[PDB]
Amino acid sequence: LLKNAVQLICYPDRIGNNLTDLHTAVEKHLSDAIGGLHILPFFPSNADGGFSPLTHKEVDPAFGTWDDIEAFTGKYDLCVDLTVNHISDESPEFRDFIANGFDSEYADLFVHVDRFGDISPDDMAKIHIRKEKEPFREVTLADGTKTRVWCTFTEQQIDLNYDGDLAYRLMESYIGFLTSKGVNLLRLDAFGYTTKRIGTSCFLVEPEVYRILDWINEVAFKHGAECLPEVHDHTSYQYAISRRNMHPYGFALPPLLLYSLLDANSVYLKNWLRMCPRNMVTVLDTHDGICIPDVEGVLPDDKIKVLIDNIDARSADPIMRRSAANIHSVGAIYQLTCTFYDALMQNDDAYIAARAIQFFTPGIPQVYYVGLLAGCNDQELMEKTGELRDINRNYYTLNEMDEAMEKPVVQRLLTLMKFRTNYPAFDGHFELNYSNDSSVAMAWRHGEHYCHLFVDLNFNTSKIQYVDVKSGETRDLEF
Amino acid sequence: LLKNAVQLICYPDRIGNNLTDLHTAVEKHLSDAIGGLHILPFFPSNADGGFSPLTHKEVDPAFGTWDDIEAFTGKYDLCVDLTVNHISDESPEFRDFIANGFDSEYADLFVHVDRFGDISPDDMAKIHIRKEKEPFREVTLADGTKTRVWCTFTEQQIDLNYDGDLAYRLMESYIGFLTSKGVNLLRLDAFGYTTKRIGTSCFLVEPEVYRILDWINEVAFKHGAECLPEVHDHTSYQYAISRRNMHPYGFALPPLLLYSLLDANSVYLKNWLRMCPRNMVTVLDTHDGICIPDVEGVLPDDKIKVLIDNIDARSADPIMRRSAANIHSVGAIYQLTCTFYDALMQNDDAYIAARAIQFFTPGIPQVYYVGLLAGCNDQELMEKTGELRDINRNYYTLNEMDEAMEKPVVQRLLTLMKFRTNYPAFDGHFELNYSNDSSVAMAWRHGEHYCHLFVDLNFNTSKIQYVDVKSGETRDLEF
Amino acid sequence: LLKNAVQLICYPDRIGNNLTDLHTAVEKHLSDAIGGLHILPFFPSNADGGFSPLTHKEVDPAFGTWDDIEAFTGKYDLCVDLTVNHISDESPEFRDFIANGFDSEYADLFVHVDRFGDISPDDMAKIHIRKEKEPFREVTLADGTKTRVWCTFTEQQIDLNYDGDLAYRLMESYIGFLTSKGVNLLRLDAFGYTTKRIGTSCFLVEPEVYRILDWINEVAFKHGAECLPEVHDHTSYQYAISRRNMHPYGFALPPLLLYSLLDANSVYLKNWLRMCPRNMVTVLDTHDGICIPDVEGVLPDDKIKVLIDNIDARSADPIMRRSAANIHSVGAIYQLTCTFYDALMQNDDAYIAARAIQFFTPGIPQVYYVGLLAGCNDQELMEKTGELRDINRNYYTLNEMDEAMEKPVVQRLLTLMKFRTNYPAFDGHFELNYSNDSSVAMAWRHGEHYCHLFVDLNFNTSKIQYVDVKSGETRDLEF
Ligand SMILES: O=P(O)(O)O[C@H]1O[C@H](CO)[C@@H](O)[C@H](O)[C@H]1O
Ligand SMILES: OC[C@H]1O[C@H](O)[C@H](O)[C@@H](O)[C@@H]1O
Ligand code: NA
């Protein structure tokens, strides 16, 4: 069991300069407002913001040491990424492949494109790949031979072969090591691409995907860890995850709420909460930006397009899904590049009301560090480094964070976080209440404990009433 | 009969400094990659990038001499402009009109607005306008009298009167001189504007336009030349040209391919290839902007707005087709001001694929020099001269071209150009192949010679298989 | 080479009672108004209105004898159907397959489904079939063995195998026999389905389709006959046919005029006329319903829907394409079940104006007999026999035809037919004229001969002025 408490999502090096400064910031400000951390990839990596790890057993010295990670465990749950799809081209295992060729003992760890034979144009177009080139890298071996390996993402990320056995060893090896350092929750990064079969989309291929997923879940449970598979596709996949004793992501909530607050409409939101999957980890913002496929169905297309058209002016160029010439269409946008606070027009009341609704949604709530600090789109950071997503990946010095913590909106968010992390009613059962089509009433009951949220989307007001058991009376949370 | 080879579209003075530097670059890089040249207007001109010639019988000394032109004819086809619509106001023929008035023997060579009497506003609205004012210039005669002449374009370009006889004389004289210098292909510039009749659109007025067009074709054949009539409107006009033993423009192809690659959609392209006008000169980019009206019907309107909206960010202010009686009105989009490479987001694979599809399209392919060198939008040049289309009219020094020739994408383009100009299969018959809705299959067969293009618009991939006749085996072209 | 004259489309037994009554009716009224006939299938048939022939070498005694056929030849062109795709299951060739099994010498004449092995679900969904059943018929052999054959249409129609040799003879045998009886023009029924290749649409498969189509055309040319391949799909195929010395169908014209007249719009019509494929056979109504896919592109989707909604009230249930649950969507309708006269709301002026535009469209005009007699939707005939297309397949007795010939509107149409068949200008060249966007101006010139149509689509007015060579002056055709 994880702590039913708010979690902080954060990089190692963007609050302060390293894992030690991160720990300093948490203890100074968040020591009793969060119950866990999701520390974004802190491994030796050579691509894509830490998501091309050479191994899961080392910490990039630029960030700290394993002792600096274990400083968080013992008081906080620890969520860490497991890049189950791919490992770096600089990894010991893949470098051994280039030197020795197919004589390498790590050969069957990777996907060899010539194994599949000729792939028809139809089977190629099926493949759910998000840039405009084939997912195939031609690498040159030490002996001069040219061969191709499966490569979904950037070329420094070589995909693993779940049709062989070696890949399961490596994950089981990684999991054993991470759990020994105190990892409670394994975020299964990009698991949907693990399933390759020519003739299918090679993404979330059923029922193979769940067998791979049940296996990893068993390994984590053996080593005292639960799983958080991250998938950006139709929400029906989140329920499949939910029904296999794993934590799905509440990705539908961010755009569902953004539309809901901007348009003063509680209908689709109440419909969702009433049927939202269980054991999910709810988010508003992530390190990636607001994802659209995750709300298809949850929100009608015309209302999704209203959302897209409303945010376009406050957001940088969106991340696109491939070959979508119609760049202002629901079917074209993959992720909206925007801080969540800019998505609500820097409206304090709207942002707090959103976080309250998140906190009363069933599941473990994660708060992204930029959102924690009510960060705005980082134009300056985005314009250097070229990374489109850095618009939501502010760097903070410890002073700049101390200063952001004094903003009135952050003090308000900080009270919600303390209330959600400590008040016992959230350990009970969720009971949605009746409301009109422009306001939402959410409540939690655990024995004598009870708390009740009411948000009027017409005026962005947030009211929480809770029962103080030490006195029996009903008080107003001041936030 | 023209050479079935790639042609270069180029100015005299924008590779190096003159026609002499131009000839140097052709022999160094393209000597066996092109079979002809379209050298943009190199006559004495006083407006609009050479298109206001005082005569077609002289070479602007800033560019070179007629001897510099004939250096190209001995080895290459020569396509040169015939401004059938207009000649300069500094021309001898028009200056004689200013001095002597209507007593000049060249008076009936020009269109006098006063023939019509009053022109009602309704008759004005029929005529489209390429300037910001009515196409009527008030000129002052030597004796002080004020009279008006028809002037479609800039006021230094005076339109000719094809209701009289003098205009046919001048064209026949112009044609004779150019063919005597080795000109094979006469580009009839803006011939659609030659037909004037109040009560009509004064543009492509039927059937007068075809009689004017059959006449010039007659003169050219006598002097050993074929014609390339330039008309930017519905593709139906391109077929009428094809059916009169003239070369139409494959003007439909550029915006069609831009869409086909951007959206990974081969349906509309495949339909067009199946019915494309025959004996046409195919282009992707020209010395002008990418023209939209030329793809109506070929491409549904909703997809055209998609295409236009996708290019808006990568293109300058568009050229508009305004009507009269309404001179300060946004009007309809005519040409997108953009390099073809910036129109494909500078995606190398997509650009090579575009040229591959062009080169397998039936007809003589022209490659515009900027496209040859994978040039980007020239913001600095456009802002320096104020000419909106100079964003696609880059200047290259001999060094700047030599360096651009070593770019990998230009090396790939140069391999295709050598293949298309030399491989004999293109002299046979075109045979389109079946494919899915995201790929194109084009093939050419001439006896034992056979070559096969496959372009997957999902991944922007280009594959050509050709048969080496001296051995009978099938090889892959490396590009 | 055919007579450039109006042709009659007619059944054998639906004017009068047999072919002799047809000959009687033709000579009495049309003897100098048409130059040829399209006699719909008059062979022994057991399915689909005559299109399931047991042989092309016999005439169904219910219709007459071959002598009744040769009575038309010598004075009229003769167009007869060649069902190149399929022959009846009661045919001599196929019964031998049932009797002997694969030991039959006619075994390789038919397509055996088990030859292809497993067909993936994707390869089945590709198949362009407009029914909701697999195009596979399970037949029981005489020896009890069960095997499957390819069957596009009704189960009495077994498809032919153009991967073998027997199919080509059977056509060559049919063609030799039909041309020996005086047939000029072979209507190649449903030729698009002759190409089978698993993984393709099995319809118009390029370039195989032209391999088959160039073959038949020569075999027909050998025996003094030209071909009329019927295909209902995008017009690009019509030019593809046109460019191989065969006659395409002007299938785009019927719905194009219907829109143009109903909405007073000549824009798309003039565009088509300017570029329409020629050496085509033009039709307005046929023995089939008014076909929608043949005008996609020629007419924008929004304007096609205008047509569909206007015809919905005056038409029976339309024939649908496969799994088209959206019964009010351009992409769903295949053919509109309606006579052409009811499609123009029984407006005499509008119907004549349509026929006038047809007769001046480049190509051989066919007049369907129901259109000839200005027939209305036959509710009674449709509700009996259950055949949805019989709403356009009126039965006429010899009296009923004599009576309809006296209708004022039929007298006008009969004047046009004489003019289009006899006036020599139509043997010259087509010249489209300028007109506003709500009227059409069409003219023909052949030497001294000249005729000029002007149709105002606002008011359905028809005027034809011709140069009478018997006096040299310009007269008005009275219709
Ligand atoms: O309609 P277009 O093609 O842009 O105009 C054409 O005639 C004009 C005057 O000759 C020139 O401005 C263009 O360079 C030429 O291509
Ligand atoms: O595979 C790694 C990529 O996708 C993952 O889901 C990460 O969340 C994203 O930040 C990264 O770009
Ligand atoms: Na693409």
Contacts of B274 (CB under 8 A, 6+ apart): B432, C206, C234, C236, C237, C239, C240
Strands C319-320 and C333-336 come out as: antiparallel
What is the distance between the alpha carbons of residues C83 and C46, in angstroms, rounded to a whole number?
14
Helix (H) or strand (E) holding C369: helix C369-372
- The tokens for C176 are 């030799």
User: DSSP assignment of A304-320, as one string?
Assistant: HHHHHHHHGGGS-SPEE
**Residue A114 among the catalytic residues:** no
| Angle in degrees, CA B254, B258, B260, rounded to 5 | 115
What is the distance between the alpha carbons of residues B289 and B338, in angstroms, rounded to a whole number?
6
Catalytic-role residue among C68, C77, C89, C189: C189
Pocket residues for ligand 1 (CB within 6 Å)?
B 48, 51, 83, 153, 189-190, 230, 232, 288
Give contacts of B346 with chain A, Cβ < 8 Å: none
What is the distance between the alpha carbons of residues C51 and C42, in angstroms, rounded to a whole number?
9
Provide the edge-to-edge strand list for the sheet that holds B461-467.
B429-432, B439-446, B449-456, B461-467, B474-476
Mutate to test the pocket of ligand 1, among B46, B51, B131, B193 (most ligand atoms within 8 A of CB): B51
Phi-psi label, residue A77: left if phi above 0, alpha if psi -120 to 50, beta otherwise: beta
Tell me if A185 sits within 8 A of A216, measured CB to CB: no
State which amino acid sits at residue C417: M
CA–CA distance from B402 to each of B343, B379, B411 (Å)? 24, 22, 12
Closest CA to B251 of B241, B261, B266, B262: B241
**Exposed, middle or buried, C273 (CB in 10 Å: 0-12/13-18/19+)?**
buried
Q: Are the Cβ atoms of C434 and B234 closer than 8 angstroms?
A: no
Tell me if A330 sits within 8 A of A304, measured CB to CB: yes
What is the distance between the alpha carbons of residues A230 and C320, in angstroms, rounded to a whole number?
43
Tell me if C334 sits within 8 A of C290, measured CB to CB: no
Strands B332-336 and B290-291 come out as: antiparallel
State which amino acid sits at residue C298: V
Q: Is A145 helix (H, G, I), strand (E, B) or coil?
A: coil
Phi-psi label, residue A465: left if phi above 0, alpha if psi -120 to 50, beta otherwise: beta
How many other CB atoms sit within 10 Å of the CB of residue B10?
A: 23
Tell me if B280 sits within 8 A of B363, measured CB to CB: yes
CA–CA distance from A338 to each of A457, B25, B244 (Å)? 21, 49, 57
Closest CA to C253 of C237, C276, C278: C276
The CA-based dihedral angle spanning residues B379, B382, B386, B390, taken in that order and rounded to the nearest 10 degrees: -160
Give contacts of A122 with chain C, Cβ < 8 Å: 122, 199
Contacts of A102 (CB under 8 A, 6+ apart): none
Residue with tokens 């974004």, as numbered in its chain: A40
Closest CA to B454 of B430, B435, B427: B435
Among C277, C301, C434, the residue with its CB nearest the CB of B206 is C434
Strands B86-88 and B128-129 come out as: unpaired
Q: How far, in Å, is the centroid of ligand 1 from the Cα of B190?
A: 6
The CA-based dihedral angle spanning residues B5, B10, B13, B15, taken in that order and rounded to the nearest 10 degrees: -70
- The tokens for C399 are 């009296």
**Residue A189 among the catalytic residues:** yes
What is the distance between the alpha carbons of residues A212 and C392, in angstroms, rounded to a whole number?
61
Residue with tokens 């030991």, as numbered in its chain: C103
What is the distance between the alpha carbons of residues B359 and C235, in angstroms, rounded to a whole number?
24
Contacts of B410 (CB under 8 A, 6+ apart): B372, B373, B374, B404
Contacts of A460 (CB under 8 A, 6+ apart): A261, A347, A349, A350, A353
User: DSSP assignment of C214-279, as one string?
Assistant: HHHHHHHHHTT-EEEE---S-THHHHHHHTTT---B-TTHHHHHHHHHHHT--HHHHHHHHH--SS
Helix (H) or strand (E) holding C431: strand C429-432
Helix (H) or strand (E) holding C444: strand C439-446
- The tokens for A43 are 């491994």
| Angle in degrees, CA A303, A308, A312, rounded to 5 | 150
Ligand nearest to the CA of A154: 2
State which amino acid sits at residue B114: D
- The tokens for A440 are 């939402």
Q: Is A134 helix (H, G, I), strand (E, B) or coil?
A: coil
Is the CB of residue A288 below 6 angstroms from any atom belonging to ligand 2? yes
- The tokens for C265 are 């719009």
State which amino acid sits at residue C25: A
What is the distance between the alpha carbons of residues B436 and B267, in angstroms, rounded to a whole number?
8
State which amino acid sits at residue C246: M
HEC assignment per residue over chain B: CCCCCCEEEECCCCECCCHHHHHHHHHHHCCCCCCEEEECCCCCECCHHHCCECCCCCCCCCCCCHHHHHHHHCCCEEEEEECCCEEECCCHHHHHHHHHHHHCCCHHHECEHHHHCCCCHHHHHCCEECCCCCCEEEEECCCCCEEEEECCCCCCEEEECCCCCHHHHHHHHHHHHHHHCCCCEEEECCHHHHCCCECECCCCCCCHHHHHHHHHHHHHHHCCCEEEECCCCCHHHHHHHHCCCCCCECCCHHHHHHHHHHHCCCHHHHHHHHHCCCCCEECCCCCCCEECHHHECCECHHHHHHHHHHHHCCCCCCEEEEECCCCCCCCEEEEECCCHHHHCCCCHHHHHHHHHHHHHCCCEEEEEHHHHCCCCCCHHHHHHHCCHHHHHCCCECHHHHHHHCCCHHHHHHHHHHHHHHHCHHHHCEEEECCCCCCEEEEEEEECCEEEEEEEECCCCEEEEEEECCCCCCEEECCC
Catalytic-role residue among A77, A189, A226, A342: A189
Closest CA to C415 of C466, C378, C370, C379: C466
User: DSSP assignment of A430-452, as one string?
Assistant: EEEE---TTEEEEEEEETTEEEE
Tell me if A311 sits within 8 A of A262, measured CB to CB: no
Of ligand 1's listed atoms, the one at least distance from the Cα of B130 is 1
Tell me if C17 sits within 8 A of C53, measured CB to CB: no
- Give the rounded distance of the alpha carbon of A197 from its chain centre: 26
DSSP conformational letter for C28: H
How many other CB atoms sit within 10 Å of the CB of residue B381?
A: 16
- The tokens for C131 are 């029914």
Contacts of C322 (CB under 8 A, 6+ apart): C129, C130, C131, C132
Closest CA to A81 of A64, A96, A69: A69
Q: Is C451 helix (H, G, I), strand (E, B) or coil?
A: strand
Give contacts of C120 with chain A, Cβ < 8 Å: 199
Q: How far, in Å, is the centroid of ligand 3 from the Cα of C447?
A: 53
B198 — phi, psi (to 5°)? -60, 135
Give contacts of C199 with chain A, Cβ < 8 Å: 120, 122
What is the distance between the alpha carbons of residues B70 and B55, in angstroms, rounded to a whole number?
18
**Exposed, middle or buried, C399 (CB in 10 Å: 0-12/13-18/19+)?**
exposed
What is the distance between the alpha carbons of residues B180 and C115, in angstroms, rounded to a whole number?
65
Q: Are the Cβ atoms of B234 and C433 closer than 8 angstroms?
A: no
CA–CA distance from A81 to each of A56, A129, B447 (Å)? 9, 21, 60
CA-based nearest residue in chain B for residue C201:
B434
Ligand nearest to the CA of B38: 1
Residue with tokens 């004898």, as numbered in its chain: C65
Contacts of B38 (CB under 8 A, 6+ apart): B7, B8, B9, B10, B79, B80, B185, B187, B366
Closest CA to A358 of A240, A463, A245, A453: A453
DSSP conformational letter for A296: B
Residue with tokens 């694979």, as numbered in its chain: B349
CA–CA distance from B177 to each of B58, B162, B165, B171, B278 (Å)? 10, 21, 19, 10, 29
What is the distance between the alpha carbons of residues A76 and A5, in angstroms, rounded to a whole number?
10
What is the distance between the alpha carbons of residues C145 and C141, in angstroms, rounded to a whole number?
5
Is the CB of residue A49 below 6 angstroms from any atom belonging to ligand 2? yes
How many other CB atoms sit within 10 Å of the CB of residue B169?
A: 12
The CA-based dihedral angle spanning residues B400, B403, B406, B412, taken in that order and rounded to the nearest 10 degrees: -10
- CA distance to partner chain B, nearest, from residue A235 (Å): 26
| Angle in degrees, CA C208, C211, C214, rounded to 5 | 145
What is the distance between the alpha carbons of residues C11 and C9, in angstroms, rounded to a whole number?
7
Ligand nearest to the CA of B350: 3
Is the CB of residue A348 below 6 angstroms from any atom belonging to ligand 2? no
Phi-psi label, residue A80: left if phi above 0, alpha if psi -120 to 50, beta otherwise: beta
Tell me if C68 sits within 8 A of C38, measured CB to CB: no
Mutate to test the pocket of ligand 1, among B288, B291, B338 (most ligand atoms within 8 A of CB): B288
Tell me if C434 sits within 8 A of B206, measured CB to CB: yes
- The tokens for B91 are 């021309």
Catalytic-role residue among B226, B230, B294, B342: B230
A114 — phi, psi (to 5°)? -70, -15
Mutation pick from C118, C120, C200 vs chain A, by most beta carbons of A within 10 Å, is: C120
What is the distance between the alpha carbons of residues B281 and B159, in angstroms, rounded to a whole number?
26
Among B309, B439, B459, the residue with its CB nearest the CB of A327 is B309
Tell me if A64 sits within 8 A of A33, measured CB to CB: no
Residue with tokens 């005029």, as numbered in its chain: C257
Mutate to test the pocket of ligand 2, among A79, A85, A189 (most ligand atoms within 8 A of CB): A189
- Give the rounded distance of the alpha carbon of C13 from its chain centre: 18
Q: Is C208 helix (H, G, I), strand (E, B) or coil?
A: helix
Strands C77-82 and C36-39 come out as: parallel
What is the distance between the alpha carbons of residues C136 and C112, in angstroms, rounded to a whole number?
9
What is the distance between the alpha carbons of residues B151 and B158, in angstroms, rounded to a whole number?
5
Contacts of C264 (CB under 8 A, 6+ apart): C438, C457, C458
CA atoms within a 13 Å half-sphere pointing along the CA-CB vector of A111? 26
Of ligand 1's listed atoms, the one at least distance from the Cα of B319 is 4
Sign of the C-alpha dihedral computed for residues A27, A33, A35 and A39 taken in this order: negative
Reported in sequence order, the residue ranges of A171-230 that DSSP labels E, i.e. its strands, are 185-188, 226-229
CA–CA distance from C274 to each of B173, B280, C299 (Å)? 32, 17, 14
Closest CA to C298 of C327, C259, C263, C329: C259
Q: Is A228 helix (H, G, I), strand (E, B) or coil?
A: strand
Q: Is C106 helix (H, G, I), strand (E, B) or coil?
A: coil
Residue with tokens 């405009």, as numbered in its chain: A132
Q: Are the Cβ atoms of B309 and A328 closer than 8 angstroms?
A: yes
Q: Return the exposure string of C143-177: e unless at least 16 CB atoms fall within 10 Å of the residue's CB, then b.
A: eeeebebbbbbeebbbbbbbeeebbbebbbebbbb
What is the distance between the alpha carbons of residues B467 and A462, in angstroms, rounded to a whole number?
74
Is the CB of residue A189 below 6 angstroms from any atom belonging to ligand 2? yes
- CA distance to partner chain B, nearest, from residue A323 (Å): 5
Tell me if A158 sits within 8 A of A109, measured CB to CB: no
Q: Return the exposure string of B347-373: e unless at least 16 CB atoms fall within 10 Å of the residue's CB, then b.
A: bbbbbbbbbbbbbbbbbbbbbbbbbbb
DSSP conformational letter for C3: -
Is the CB of residue A390 below 6 angstroms from any atom belonging to ligand 2? no
Give contacts of B438 with chain A, Cβ < 8 Å: 121, 125, 323
Q: How far, in Å, is the centroid of ligand 3 from the Cα of B350?
A: 7
Q: How far, in Å, is the centroid of ligand 3 from the Cα of B256?
A: 13
B329 — phi, psi (to 5°)? -120, 140
B392 — phi, psi (to 5°)? -115, 15
What is the distance between the alpha carbons of residues B415 and C87, in angstroms, rounded to a whole number?
51
Contacting chains of C (3 CB pairs or more, <8 Å) are A, B
Give the bridge partners for C272, in sequence order.
none
What is the distance between the alpha carbons of residues B87 and B275, in angstroms, rounded to a whole number?
36
C27 — phi, psi (to 5°)? -65, -35
Query: Which residue minimizes the CA distance to atom 4 of ligand 1?
Result: B288
- CA distance to partner chain A, nearest, from residue C113 (Å): 22
Closest CA to A357 of A470, A462, A435: A462
Taking every pair of Cα atoms in chain B, the longest distance, rounded to a whole number of angstroms, is 79
What is the distance between the alpha carbons of residues A442 and A440, in angstroms, rounded to a whole number?
7
Asked if the peptide bond before residue C248 counts as cis, ω within 30 degrees of 0, the response is: no
Sign of the C-alpha dihedral computed for residues A346, A348, A349 and A354 taken in this order: positive
Helix (H) or strand (E) holding C319: strand C319-320
Catalytic-role residue among A159, A230, A285, A294: A230
- CA distance to partner chain C, nearest, from residue B297 (Å): 6
Rg (CA), chain B: 22
What is the distance between the alpha carbons of residues C58 and C305, in angstroms, rounded to a whole number?
44
Residues in chain C: 479
* Contacts by residues A205-209 (CB-CB < 8 Å, ≥ 24 positions apart): none
State which amino acid sits at residue B57: K
Closest CA to B366 of B40, B63, B14: B40
**Exposed, middle or buried, C35 (CB in 10 Å: 0-12/13-18/19+)?**
buried
